[PDB]
Design a protein around this nucleic acid. Structure first.
Lengths: 171, 126
RNA sequence: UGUACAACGGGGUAUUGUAAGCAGUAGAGUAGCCUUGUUGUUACGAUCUGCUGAGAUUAAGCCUUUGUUGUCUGAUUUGU
RNA sequence: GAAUGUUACCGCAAUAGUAAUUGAACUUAGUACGAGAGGAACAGUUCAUUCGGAUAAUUGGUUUUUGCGGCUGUCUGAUCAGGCAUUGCCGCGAAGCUACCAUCCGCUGGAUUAUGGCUGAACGCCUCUAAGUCAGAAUCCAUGCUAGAACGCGGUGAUUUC
RNA sequence: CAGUCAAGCGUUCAUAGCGACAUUGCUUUUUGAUUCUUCGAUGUCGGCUCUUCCUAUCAUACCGAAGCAGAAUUCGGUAA
RNA sequence: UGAACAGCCUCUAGUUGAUAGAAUAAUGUAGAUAAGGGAAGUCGGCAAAAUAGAUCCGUAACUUCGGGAUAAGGAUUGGC
RNA sequence: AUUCAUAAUAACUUUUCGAAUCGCAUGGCCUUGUGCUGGCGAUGGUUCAUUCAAAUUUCUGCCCUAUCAACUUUCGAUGGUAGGAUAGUGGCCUACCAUGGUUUCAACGGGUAACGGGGAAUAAGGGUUCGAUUCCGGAGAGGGAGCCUGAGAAACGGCUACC
RNA sequence: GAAACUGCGAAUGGCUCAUUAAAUCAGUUAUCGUUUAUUUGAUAGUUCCUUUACUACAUGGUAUAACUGUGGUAAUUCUAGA
């Protein structure tokens, strides 16, 4: 099986090809939002605790929230909802999914960390991806920094230097 | 192996124990026992049958599953820079914000500038 | 006269489907009360809900008992 | 089931009975063979047909558990709880019985036939035969399985007292 | 039902396979013929059920021959 | 109860008679149910099942015009 | 021709609109302040009217058939009252009520190699026949049903199901 | 200045004539019985709601896409996770 684990503060993410079939039998019959023990799955993950975010089973059909079963279903989905993007306004659509219970049918299980255990993880905690963008709005910058109502966000602006050739500029 | 759930009673069906039914519409039902099977053939409603899990959960009996939703009593705790602002100098200028005579003097400069602007504009208009 | 036996009791396991009794600001409503409410009260009224996966039955050819109460020398025959 | 000295236990095994049967599929192989057309086989594997012998975990059936619930009519002043209705009727229904309607199992060695042969004369050759001799079948007999001679047997234990 | 013989058929060749004309036998599952028993009664067709037996073997086991390349087929033997 | 001196229960009156007791093997007699299929059984759907009351709806051919006709075939039915 | 337009009293609203939008140009007063004012536009925005539409609607008019004369109303057929729905009237639908309504002046039913019309061939006149078919109005997207989005679809080169 | 968010439009066009015989349609009326985006012409002094601190108006809050990357199906204009 695979565990697509993520650490959201570091913004990091990695897949882990898991075996120890019984240390994933623990994951069996589990819902979304629930948090089980890193040590229980793996002493390499000793002390850690994750949260079962979701996952794709075979045939790539994701895990959807709220349905409360492991078996697959055909839902007449609509906008503002996971597992369907509408290619037109108004289009509802019947699509197949898998539900919010964990079992062998799954192939990749998506996890998020809420607490960092005692040891350190190679591709999640030792690393941290930066914030790709800076806040583009005045007050968002202003409150992000904690300056004032009048501290000139215009000069607190972000400047991201890049070189076209040798001419360089922050754009 | 796996264990499953009676359509009617909603009970674990250990392997072999029990019957299975496949309606013409390809709906696969499972029954732990001929009791459930016979009721199903009678077209009964388990939500009305009392000993069933559906009635149990519809009348809210044995409700030890749900507890509450947790809440954190704090903030995000990141007054960080925006990757192009040098957070040290950012906090330094945030602290220089009070005692605002600097921005006030810049305003006074641009203010006398607007004075002279209207003056010279009227001069050019004349 | 015993890790003895038996009848009851208990526990378990199974079957069934939520006992009677009480209560209800539940109840189609119909009549009568008046301080005519805002649950108004009263008589009747299937049925519903809570106590209640409650109650009942459970070896008679189910299992098990630290329990209780008892029982435990009557007859006949047999020889290389 | 008398009788064998009594009684109990463990055994032998004469004799009799006997059972397992057939097919398909994959593979061998689109190979061999065949000009082409078409088209094999032995071994191996998985399955089934027929028959048999058991068993009841599962499923199904059966239900006087007259166990639980409900239903009609009527009787017990009403309720509670019950009687009668040739087991009143329905639904569930354990246990037990039971089903190719369910499941499990169904042995390997020898002598042989037919047939093909080895050496080999008669018949100075030759010949499977005449003496001798090899392999060989759903055959035959044993292994195995069933009963155990009630006049077939053995081993062992204890064998009565005032 | 099975043999002897072999004019002929079988492209040519009587016998791989068939085998007219002639002929020797077998069986009692037919149908006759007979009337021994049975007319002071042997319950009278078939089917159903169920066992057992014969083999003149339809299939299956092993084999031989072919006008058997292979497949398919035919003839024949031990075999019920 | 119900269309009903039907069937079923009861009152008055009358009976409690018919050898009995113990167990519950086969085969029977009488009664019943049976998964999937549905007369393949058999001389032949023999026997058994299914249908069944009432209200409403609808109703073929053929006809001696009277009928066929409860045609067929469908729906509903409790309690308060 | 109105209970019209429109105005006011009294309240209702889970609360509607009343510019936090954008490009150019930068203009003027001095109370010398980033004070105050200012232009040409785009976008959107409540109401009314307009325009392109849309839906309903009055009178008249349609081929052959009586080997189709009674048709409609169970469970809407005709009307009325009240209400619901509609964007809106109204059996459009329901509750209740009266039992009516169409018919030989051919109802109703059947058939149509029938979409209709503007028009085409053909002729002295009269006329007969055709007209799917370039323009107009309708219907449909394989048959049916449903519906979201939207001002506008019962959309199909959009969704849902069944066939 | 791709992609993406957003706003428009995708209900026009085009094709066929299956349907349909008071139905469509044609002329002819009405909406004093209705919707109408869009255009076009006009049109929001009155929005502090214990209306005094209850509230920045040189102006307020929230994602979320695109993207970063983890990726999952044999396949889909398939899509989740951070």
């Amino acid at each position: 099986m695979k565990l697509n684990i993520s650490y959201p503060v570091n913004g990091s993410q990695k897949t882990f090809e898991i075996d120890d079939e019984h240390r994933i039998r623990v994951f069996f019959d589990k819902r979304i939002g629930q948090e089980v023990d890193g040590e229980a799955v793996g002493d390499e993950f000793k002390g850690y605790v994750f949260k079962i975010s979701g996952g794709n089973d075979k045939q790539g059909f994701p895990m959807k929230q709220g349905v409360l079963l492991p078996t697959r279903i055909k839902l007449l989905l609509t906008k503002n909802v996971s597992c369907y993007r509408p290619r037109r306004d108004g289009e509802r659509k019947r699509k197949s999914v898998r539900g919010a219970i964990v079992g062998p049918d799954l192939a990749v299980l998506a996890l998020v960390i809420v607490k960092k255990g005692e040891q350190e993880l190679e591709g999640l905690t030792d690393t941290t991806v930066p914030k790709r963008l800076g806040p583009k709005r005045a007050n968002n910058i202003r409150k992000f920094f904690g300056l004032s109502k009048e501290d000139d966000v215009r000069d607190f602006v972000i400047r991201r230097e890049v070189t076209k050739g040798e001419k360089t500029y922050t754009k | 192996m796996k264990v499953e759930i009676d359509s009617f009673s909603g009970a674990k069906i250990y392997p072999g124990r029990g019957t299975l039914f496949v309606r013409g519409d390809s709906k696969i039902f499972r029954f732990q026992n001929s009791k459930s099977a016979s009721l199903f053939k009678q077209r009964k409603n388990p939500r009305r049958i009392a000993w069933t899990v559906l009635f149990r959960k519809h009348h809210k009996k044995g409700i030890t599953e749900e507890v509450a939703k947790k809440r954190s009593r704090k903030t995000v705790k990141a007054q960080r820079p925006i990757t192009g602002a040098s957070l040290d100098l950012i906090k330094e200028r945030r602290s220089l914000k009070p005692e605002v005579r600097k921005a006030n003097r810049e305003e006074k400069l641009k203010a006398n500038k607007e004075k002279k602007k209207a003056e010279k504009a009227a001069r050019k208009a004349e």
